[PDB]
Amino acid sequence: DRQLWRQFPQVEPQLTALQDYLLRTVQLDNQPIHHKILALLKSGGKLLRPGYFYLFSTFGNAATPAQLQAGAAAIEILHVGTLIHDDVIDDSPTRRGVRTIQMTYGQRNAIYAGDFMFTVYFDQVLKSTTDRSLIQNHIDAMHRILQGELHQMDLNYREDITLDAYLNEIAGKTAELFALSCYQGAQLAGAPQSVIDRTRDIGIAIGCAYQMLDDILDYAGDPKRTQKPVLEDLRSGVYSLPLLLSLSHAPRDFHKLLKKKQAMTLEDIKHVQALVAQYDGVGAAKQLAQDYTDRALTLIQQLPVGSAQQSLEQLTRLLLRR
Amino acid sequence: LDRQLWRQFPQVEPQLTALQDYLLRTVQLDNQPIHHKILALLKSGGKLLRPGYFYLFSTFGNAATPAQLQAGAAAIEILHVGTLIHDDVIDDQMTYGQRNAIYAGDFMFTVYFDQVLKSTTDRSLIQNHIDAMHRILQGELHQMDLNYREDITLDAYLNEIAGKTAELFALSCYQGAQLAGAPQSVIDRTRDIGIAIGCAYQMLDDILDYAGDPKRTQKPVLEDLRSGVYSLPLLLSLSHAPRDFHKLLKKKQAMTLEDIKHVQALVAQYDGVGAAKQLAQDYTDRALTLIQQLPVGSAQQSLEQLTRLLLRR
């Protein structure tokens, strides 16, 4: 995860510097809460979204290393800040191995810490650019990530969940940060219009695929044995891709088990898992993931030829095939 | 504490009237559960005190368009509401009304930036907004480290309330003067005026906790003492009996309904209410003195009238 950037010589020093930069950007009076934010940063040195930002910055020559560093920090800080808040809403005890902030310091302090990160985020955005449309683009993205958070919340316990609805949700919730990464990196660096016109569609596709692969791993593996991630998902009424693709095959059978919601039992989830396996929801999901992956890879192949395109292909294939 | 308060300051009445509608349009959202939570906080907050300071200082200049000023005044109110929503969460699964609150506040922060950017093209002015929201959220996070502290200095109280309450007043006075292109002599005074009004305003709020009925039990002080938030009247009483208070305060959440009456009686005994009314009046005087240094005229007049209305009443 950290040392996949060994395979990427032209951006590894940029990402190594970014880690150190990120740890310096968070300066807080409250040292117990400062230690927790920093710990979340230390266990997230894979820096995939900054990775995409930097890779796309190599298509232009107009941004300084200070601007790029600020632009890449902004993305990661926005990522971590939304995570802190998402972990409050989902009531999550763990994130990247470490215990979440609300568990150790209370829900309000976790919210405040998330809010704090938004102030650091906007500070880095301003440090990255003087260009007002680039700033607006960040605001619009932040607005779209939140819209994707509410779309998820309106879809809770909804068994009539359409594929369209799922795509619109995850495009805001997960894909928007990938699109913002690619777009800001290329636009700050002054890449040519043909690169810029493709960044968002590349980012959206990769992000959509990336979320799909997380949903796959929920229902993958051992069917007759209970799963930790799915239990909290089903009781909260979050029906991820393999399940939602399976609902149409047997609507009444599913509604029987899912009517219960929170009350859902330990054996009732095994029934849901057995049904998803029976109708091959996992297999159907992998197909979509692969088709979104191929769309990303195709669009990367329409970019200017060079070491950059090659690195984008390698990163996308590493992320989405394995 | 009125919506019709602005009849008394008719120079800035049309814009503050216009701002109410503008705020409602700016806050429009698909999700009706969240949209109504925000709409209920705007209709209970038609005072628009902080935009009032903004617009009063803006009369010292004419550089900005009406749209820019309106955007600037909206940003301040939006930031205020956003932090208010996030203050209405609890320490410590997650209720439906609380998931909505977190998202509502986060929505307000995105709209805040949007309005900031709409108000100015000037980068130091945008940076000023960031630093302010930074200081407010620093000071909100600093409250955690001041809970259940008997040994807290007066200086740390001043710092706490500077971030939590005063910063927003400083921000309004500054942005109003700077956006409108007021003379630098006005601008140089705005932050200090705002801090002083804000600090006094918070002191007046801390006074109203320990002022009603000392024999009875009031609604807001109930949570505060159990949570570990000690108001100024109490903080100016802790020197008088550091042994006697420590017995009653370490109970914390454990304090009973007659535990807190013993604390309320002890503050009435050492007259912390009167000791805090001195400090409020000191800062009210300091605020009014700084306002007296501004150029003579209607803007200075109105700023005095507003400040007196907020602090002497």
mmCIF file of all heavy atoms in Angstrom, chain A residues 7 48 59 69 85 90 104 112 149 154 156 174 176 180 193 198 221 230 232 243 258-259 271 282 293-294 296 317:
data_model
loop_
_atom_site.group_PDB
_atom_site.id
_atom_site.type_symbol
_atom_site.label_atom_id
_atom_site.label_comp_id
_atom_site.label_asym_id
_atom_site.label_seq_id
_atom_site.Cartn_x
_atom_site.Cartn_y
_atom_site.Cartn_z
ATOM 1 N N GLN A 7 7.127 1.215 -7.633
ATOM 2 C CA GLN A 7 6.892 0.966 -9.057
ATOM 3 C C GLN A 7 6.717 2.250 -9.876
ATOM 4 O O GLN A 7 6.671 2.204 -11.106
ATOM 5 C CB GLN A 7 5.655 0.084 -9.237
ATOM 6 C CG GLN A 7 5.760 -1.306 -8.619
ATOM 7 C CD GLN A 7 4.400 -1.972 -8.440
ATOM 8 O OE1 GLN A 7 3.601 -1.566 -7.592
ATOM 9 N NE2 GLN A 7 4.137 -3.006 -9.235
ATOM 10 N N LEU A 48 -3.795 7.433 -2.763
ATOM 11 C CA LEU A 48 -4.228 7.123 -4.128
ATOM 12 C C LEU A 48 -4.748 8.333 -4.887
ATOM 13 O O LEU A 48 -4.407 8.525 -6.056
ATOM 14 C CB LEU A 48 -5.310 6.031 -4.120
ATOM 15 C CG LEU A 48 -5.103 4.785 -3.255
ATOM 16 C CD1 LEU A 48 -6.326 3.896 -3.350
ATOM 17 C CD2 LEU A 48 -3.832 4.014 -3.631
ATOM 18 N N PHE A 59 1.124 16.174 -17.205
ATOM 19 C CA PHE A 59 0.708 16.562 -18.567
ATOM 20 C C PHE A 59 0.844 18.061 -18.851
ATOM 21 O O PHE A 59 0.683 18.503 -19.992
ATOM 22 C CB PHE A 59 -0.739 16.124 -18.849
ATOM 23 C CG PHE A 59 -0.918 14.640 -18.985
ATOM 24 C CD1 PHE A 59 -1.467 13.896 -17.948
ATOM 25 C CD2 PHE A 59 -0.552 13.985 -20.162
ATOM 26 C CE1 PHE A 59 -1.640 12.512 -18.073
ATOM 27 C CE2 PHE A 59 -0.718 12.606 -20.299
ATOM 28 C CZ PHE A 59 -1.267 11.869 -19.258
ATOM 29 N N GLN A 69 1.751 20.676 -4.277
ATOM 30 C CA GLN A 69 1.749 20.117 -2.930
ATOM 31 C C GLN A 69 0.508 20.551 -2.168
ATOM 32 O O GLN A 69 -0.056 19.762 -1.413
ATOM 33 C CB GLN A 69 2.994 20.563 -2.174
ATOM 34 C CG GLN A 69 3.321 19.714 -0.976
ATOM 35 C CD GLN A 69 4.758 19.881 -0.522
ATOM 36 O OE1 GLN A 69 5.507 18.907 -0.443
ATOM 37 N NE2 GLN A 69 5.152 21.117 -0.227
ATOM 38 N N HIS A 85 -16.334 12.356 9.645
ATOM 39 C CA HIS A 85 -17.778 12.534 9.713
ATOM 40 C C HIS A 85 -18.589 11.297 9.335
ATOM 41 O O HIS A 85 -19.600 11.012 9.973
ATOM 42 C CB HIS A 85 -18.203 13.730 8.858
ATOM 43 C CG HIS A 85 -18.007 15.042 9.545
ATOM 44 N ND1 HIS A 85 -18.594 16.209 9.109
ATOM 45 C CD2 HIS A 85 -17.299 15.366 10.656
ATOM 46 C CE1 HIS A 85 -18.243 17.198 9.911
ATOM 47 N NE2 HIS A 85 -17.462 16.714 10.860
ATOM 48 N N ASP A 90 -22.071 6.449 10.482
ATOM 49 C CA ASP A 90 -22.133 4.991 10.383
ATOM 50 C C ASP A 90 -21.871 4.294 11.715
ATOM 51 O O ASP A 90 -22.033 3.072 11.816
ATOM 52 C CB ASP A 90 -21.139 4.480 9.332
ATOM 53 C CG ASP A 90 -21.566 4.805 7.908
ATOM 54 O OD1 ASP A 90 -22.747 5.158 7.689
ATOM 55 O OD2 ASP A 90 -20.713 4.699 7.000
ATOM 56 N N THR A 104 -13.217 7.408 21.277
ATOM 57 C CA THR A 104 -12.247 7.763 22.303
ATOM 58 C C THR A 104 -12.532 9.133 22.944
ATOM 59 O O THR A 104 -12.166 9.360 24.099
ATOM 60 C CB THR A 104 -10.799 7.725 21.727
ATOM 61 O OG1 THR A 104 -10.712 6.754 20.674
ATOM 62 C CG2 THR A 104 -9.792 7.376 22.800
ATOM 63 N N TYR A 112 -16.315 18.255 15.402
ATOM 64 C CA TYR A 112 -15.456 19.438 15.435
ATOM 65 C C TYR A 112 -14.122 19.202 14.731
ATOM 66 O O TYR A 112 -13.665 20.069 13.985
ATOM 67 C CB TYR A 112 -15.209 19.920 16.872
ATOM 68 C CG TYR A 112 -16.394 20.569 17.555
ATOM 69 C CD1 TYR A 112 -16.535 20.507 18.947
ATOM 70 C CD2 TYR A 112 -17.378 21.239 16.818
ATOM 71 C CE1 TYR A 112 -17.624 21.098 19.585
ATOM 72 C CE2 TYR A 112 -18.478 21.830 17.445
ATOM 73 C CZ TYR A 112 -18.595 21.749 18.826
ATOM 74 O OH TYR A 112 -19.669 22.338 19.449
ATOM 75 N N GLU A 149 -23.930 11.846 -0.060
ATOM 76 C CA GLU A 149 -24.050 11.327 1.289
ATOM 77 C C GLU A 149 -25.524 11.270 1.694
ATOM 78 O O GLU A 149 -25.952 10.329 2.367
ATOM 79 C CB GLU A 149 -23.239 12.195 2.253
ATOM 80 C CG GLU A 149 -22.492 11.413 3.308
ATOM 81 C CD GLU A 149 -21.370 10.580 2.749
ATOM 82 O OE1 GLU A 149 -20.309 11.152 2.419
ATOM 83 O OE2 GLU A 149 -21.557 9.349 2.645
ATOM 84 N N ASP A 154 -31.209 8.631 1.943
ATOM 85 C CA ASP A 154 -32.575 8.480 1.434
ATOM 86 C C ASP A 154 -32.837 7.076 0.882
ATOM 87 O O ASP A 154 -33.988 6.686 0.689
ATOM 88 C CB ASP A 154 -32.866 9.506 0.336
ATOM 89 C CG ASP A 154 -32.857 10.941 0.841
ATOM 90 O OD1 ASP A 154 -32.874 11.167 2.071
ATOM 91 O OD2 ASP A 154 -32.835 11.853 -0.011
ATOM 92 N N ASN A 156 -31.847 4.317 2.420
ATOM 93 C CA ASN A 156 -31.797 3.354 3.517
ATOM 94 C C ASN A 156 -33.093 2.561 3.629
ATOM 95 O O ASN A 156 -34.185 3.142 3.596
ATOM 96 C CB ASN A 156 -31.423 4.027 4.842
ATOM 97 C CG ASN A 156 -29.918 4.205 5.001
ATOM 98 O OD1 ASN A 156 -29.315 3.675 5.927
ATOM 99 N ND2 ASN A 156 -29.307 4.937 4.084
ATOM 100 N N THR A 174 -18.047 8.459 -3.526
ATOM 101 C CA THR A 174 -16.708 7.899 -3.685
ATOM 102 C C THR A 174 -15.969 8.428 -4.923
ATOM 103 O O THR A 174 -14.756 8.646 -4.881
ATOM 104 C CB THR A 174 -16.755 6.343 -3.672
ATOM 105 O OG1 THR A 174 -17.278 5.898 -2.415
ATOM 106 C CG2 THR A 174 -15.373 5.725 -3.870
ATOM 107 N N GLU A 176 -16.289 11.287 -6.735
ATOM 108 C CA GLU A 176 -16.094 12.723 -6.920
ATOM 109 C C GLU A 176 -14.689 13.191 -6.538
ATOM 110 O O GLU A 176 -14.118 14.051 -7.202
ATOM 111 C CB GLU A 176 -17.169 13.519 -6.170
ATOM 112 C CG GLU A 176 -17.153 15.034 -6.426
ATOM 113 C CD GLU A 176 -17.477 15.418 -7.861
ATOM 114 O OE1 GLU A 176 -18.221 14.678 -8.542
ATOM 115 O OE2 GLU A 176 -16.998 16.481 -8.306
ATOM 116 N N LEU A 180 -12.122 15.076 -8.922
ATOM 117 C CA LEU A 180 -11.522 16.328 -8.462
ATOM 118 C C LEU A 180 -9.995 16.261 -8.513
ATOM 119 O O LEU A 180 -9.364 17.205 -8.988
ATOM 120 C CB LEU A 180 -11.997 16.667 -7.050
ATOM 121 C CG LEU A 180 -11.445 17.920 -6.352
ATOM 122 C CD1 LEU A 180 -12.010 19.190 -6.937
ATOM 123 C CD2 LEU A 180 -11.759 17.862 -4.873
ATOM 124 N N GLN A 193 -6.086 21.125 -23.419
ATOM 125 C CA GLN A 193 -7.541 20.914 -23.305
ATOM 126 C C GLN A 193 -8.010 19.471 -23.480
ATOM 127 O O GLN A 193 -8.936 19.044 -22.802
ATOM 128 C CB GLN A 193 -8.340 21.821 -24.247
ATOM 129 C CG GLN A 193 -8.709 23.199 -23.673
ATOM 130 C CD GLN A 193 -9.478 23.146 -22.353
ATOM 131 O OE1 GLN A 193 -9.201 23.924 -21.437
ATOM 132 N NE2 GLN A 193 -10.446 22.235 -22.251
ATOM 133 N N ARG A 198 -10.996 15.173 -20.409
ATOM 134 C CA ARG A 198 -11.146 13.751 -20.116
ATOM 135 C C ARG A 198 -10.930 13.382 -18.656
ATOM 136 O O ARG A 198 -11.210 12.247 -18.261
ATOM 137 C CB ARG A 198 -10.191 12.936 -20.991
ATOM 138 C CG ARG A 198 -10.818 12.373 -22.255
ATOM 139 C CD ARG A 198 -9.749 11.982 -23.264
ATOM 140 N NE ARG A 198 -9.485 13.091 -24.176
ATOM 141 C CZ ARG A 198 -9.705 13.066 -25.486
ATOM 142 N NH1 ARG A 198 -10.173 11.971 -26.069
ATOM 143 N NH2 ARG A 198 -9.442 14.142 -26.214
ATOM 144 N N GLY A 221 -16.128 -14.284 -0.612
ATOM 145 C CA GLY A 221 -15.694 -15.247 0.382
ATOM 146 C C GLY A 221 -16.667 -16.300 0.882
ATOM 147 O O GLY A 221 -17.307 -16.981 0.094
ATOM 148 N N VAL A 230 -21.178 -6.991 6.448
ATOM 149 C CA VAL A 230 -22.538 -7.077 5.909
ATOM 150 C C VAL A 230 -23.611 -6.935 6.996
ATOM 151 O O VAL A 230 -24.681 -6.372 6.744
ATOM 152 C CB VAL A 230 -22.745 -8.394 5.112
ATOM 153 C CG1 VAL A 230 -23.959 -8.300 4.209
ATOM 154 C CG2 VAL A 230 -21.530 -8.695 4.262
ATOM 155 N N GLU A 232 -23.722 -5.075 9.741
ATOM 156 C CA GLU A 232 -23.999 -3.679 10.064
ATOM 157 C C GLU A 232 -24.640 -2.963 8.873
ATOM 158 O O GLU A 232 -25.400 -2.008 9.052
ATOM 159 C CB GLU A 232 -22.712 -2.964 10.492
ATOM 160 C CG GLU A 232 -22.914 -1.801 11.474
ATOM 161 C CD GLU A 232 -22.710 -2.197 12.937
ATOM 162 O OE1 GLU A 232 -23.149 -3.300 13.339
ATOM 163 O OE2 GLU A 232 -22.102 -1.398 13.687
ATOM 164 N N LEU A 243 -26.057 -7.394 -3.617
ATOM 165 C CA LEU A 243 -27.421 -7.573 -3.132
ATOM 166 C C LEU A 243 -28.460 -6.894 -4.017
ATOM 167 O O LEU A 243 -29.468 -7.511 -4.374
ATOM 168 C CB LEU A 243 -27.571 -7.097 -1.683
ATOM 169 C CG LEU A 243 -29.004 -7.150 -1.132
ATOM 170 C CD1 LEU A 243 -29.504 -8.584 -1.013
ATOM 171 C CD2 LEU A 243 -29.106 -6.463 0.184
ATOM 172 N N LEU A 258 -35.428 -8.898 4.918
ATOM 173 C CA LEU A 258 -34.975 -7.519 5.110
ATOM 174 C C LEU A 258 -36.016 -6.607 5.754
ATOM 175 O O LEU A 258 -35.731 -5.431 5.988
ATOM 176 C CB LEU A 258 -34.526 -6.898 3.776
ATOM 177 C CG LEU A 258 -33.395 -7.504 2.937
ATOM 178 C CD1 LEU A 258 -33.444 -6.928 1.530
ATOM 179 C CD2 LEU A 258 -32.029 -7.278 3.563
ATOM 180 N N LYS A 259 -37.211 -7.126 5.962
ATOM 181 C CA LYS A 259 -38.286 -6.367 6.570
ATOM 182 C C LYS A 259 -37.892 -6.052 7.980
ATOM 183 O O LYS A 259 -38.240 -5.028 8.525
ATOM 184 C CB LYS A 259 -39.591 -7.149 6.554
ATOM 185 C CG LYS A 259 -40.815 -6.260 6.608
ATOM 186 C CD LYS A 259 -42.097 -7.050 6.821
ATOM 187 C CE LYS A 259 -43.322 -6.143 6.743
ATOM 188 N NZ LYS A 259 -44.469 -6.633 7.550
ATOM 189 N N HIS A 271 -29.019 -16.385 5.162
ATOM 190 C CA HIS A 271 -30.028 -16.605 4.128
ATOM 191 C C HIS A 271 -29.851 -15.619 2.969
ATOM 192 O O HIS A 271 -29.856 -16.023 1.803
ATOM 193 C CB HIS A 271 -31.438 -16.488 4.715
ATOM 194 C CG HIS A 271 -31.963 -17.760 5.307
ATOM 195 N ND1 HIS A 271 -31.476 -18.296 6.481
ATOM 196 C CD2 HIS A 271 -32.946 -18.595 4.892
ATOM 197 C CE1 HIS A 271 -32.129 -19.410 6.758
ATOM 198 N NE2 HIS A 271 -33.027 -19.614 5.810
ATOM 199 N N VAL A 282 -22.553 -11.501 -6.865
ATOM 200 C CA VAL A 282 -21.113 -11.225 -6.834
ATOM 201 C C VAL A 282 -20.521 -11.248 -8.241
ATOM 202 O O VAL A 282 -19.790 -10.331 -8.627
ATOM 203 C CB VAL A 282 -20.356 -12.220 -5.907
ATOM 204 C CG1 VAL A 282 -18.844 -11.998 -5.953
ATOM 205 C CG2 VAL A 282 -20.844 -12.085 -4.482
ATOM 206 N N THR A 293 -13.916 -0.341 -15.181
ATOM 207 C CA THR A 293 -12.459 -0.418 -15.299
ATOM 208 C C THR A 293 -12.003 -0.231 -16.744
ATOM 209 O O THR A 293 -11.128 0.588 -17.018
ATOM 210 C CB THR A 293 -11.927 -1.763 -14.747
ATOM 211 O OG1 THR A 293 -12.258 -1.870 -13.361
ATOM 212 C CG2 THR A 293 -10.420 -1.863 -14.886
ATOM 213 N N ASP A 294 -12.629 -0.963 -17.664
ATOM 214 C CA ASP A 294 -12.274 -0.910 -19.082
ATOM 215 C C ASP A 294 -12.569 0.437 -19.701
ATOM 216 O O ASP A 294 -11.912 0.830 -20.658
ATOM 217 C CB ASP A 294 -13.009 -1.996 -19.879
ATOM 218 C CG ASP A 294 -12.531 -3.401 -19.544
ATOM 219 O OD1 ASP A 294 -11.618 -3.552 -18.700
ATOM 220 O OD2 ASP A 294 -13.083 -4.362 -20.119
ATOM 221 N N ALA A 296 -12.453 3.338 -18.008
ATOM 222 C CA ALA A 296 -11.357 4.138 -17.482
ATOM 223 C C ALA A 296 -10.093 3.939 -18.325
ATOM 224 O O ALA A 296 -9.571 4.910 -18.902
ATOM 225 C CB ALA A 296 -11.104 3.773 -16.033
ATOM 226 N N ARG A 317 -4.804 -0.324 -13.391
ATOM 227 C CA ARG A 317 -4.777 -1.795 -13.427
ATOM 228 C C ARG A 317 -4.396 -2.422 -12.089
ATOM 229 O O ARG A 317 -4.937 -3.460 -11.721
ATOM 230 C CB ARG A 317 -3.833 -2.314 -14.523
ATOM 231 C CG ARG A 317 -4.366 -2.166 -15.954
ATOM 232 C CD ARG A 317 -3.440 -2.814 -16.996
ATOM 233 N NE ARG A 317 -3.831 -2.465 -18.364
ATOM 234 C CZ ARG A 317 -4.732 -3.124 -19.099
ATOM 235 N NH1 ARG A 317 -5.354 -4.195 -18.618
ATOM 236 N NH2 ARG A 317 -5.014 -2.707 -20.328
#
